[PDB]
Symmetry: C2
Subunit: 137 residues, 2 copies
């Protein structure tokens, strides 16, 4: 289930983080507007850039901490507040986060592994609702 999935993701976090983020950017190419330094690069080019791997791993590390602190896939209000108030997230809307979790859930469903995709879907929905309550437009 959810707790084992956090352990699975964390065990190879840079690889999963890159693969899922690439699935997100390829499914929703307009999202690269928020990441101008990734424009014009294939998946393997981005996976060779230490700054891409560093960024995505740090994102997914924070995601895993928020996931681990959740109860029954409900994140803490204070973690949503952290995500809304980060300077790097100013101007973002909840649709950006919604799209990231759609890509993550579809990645898990298409993997040959027994991820608890329903729990990640509910986690993403609950986090988006919390982000909105915490002030994200």
């Amino acid at each position: 289930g959810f707790k084992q999935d956090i352990a699975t993701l964390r065990g190879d976090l840079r690889t999963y983080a890159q693969d899922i983020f690439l699935a997100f950017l390829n499914k929703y190419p307009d999202e690269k507007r928020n990441f101008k330094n990734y424009v014009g690069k294939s998946d393997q080019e981005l996976k060779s850039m230490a700054k891409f791997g560093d960024h995505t791993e740090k994102v997914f590390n924070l995601m895993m901490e928020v996931a681990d602190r959740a109860t029954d896939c409900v994140p803490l209000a204070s973690d949503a507040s952290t995500l809304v108030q980060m300077k790097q997230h100013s101007g973002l809307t909840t649709g950006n986060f919604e799209k990231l979790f759609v890509a993550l859930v579809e990645y898990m469903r298409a993997s040959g592994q027994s991820f608890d995709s329903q729990s990640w879907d509910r986690f993403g929905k609950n986090l988006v609702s919390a982000l909105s309550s915490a002030g994200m437009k």
Copy 2:
């Protein structure tokens, strides 16, 4: 304390993992016989190799999970058993792990950050004992 230290390390894990592993290899140069592609290379040359960064980060991915699942710095017997039974650890003895944690604790003591170095020293001791109980010579 110990739990916060896990979060600190995970927040910049590729850097910490490489730097701590280098401190281990430089304190105990004989240990490089287990890592023959790292012989004859300076620190900067190792940090340019994706193999070195990928290996050390996957090691620390798992080490942080083992630390995270511990209670009062006592690791799970299941985690010790996994570490003993991993094919990559065939022939290793608990002294190899002792030295890794000595280097880790010394790195923390020298860092200027408020790492809980005594808890990592205790964690290392308890892990060595649990490896022995799980059959490591």
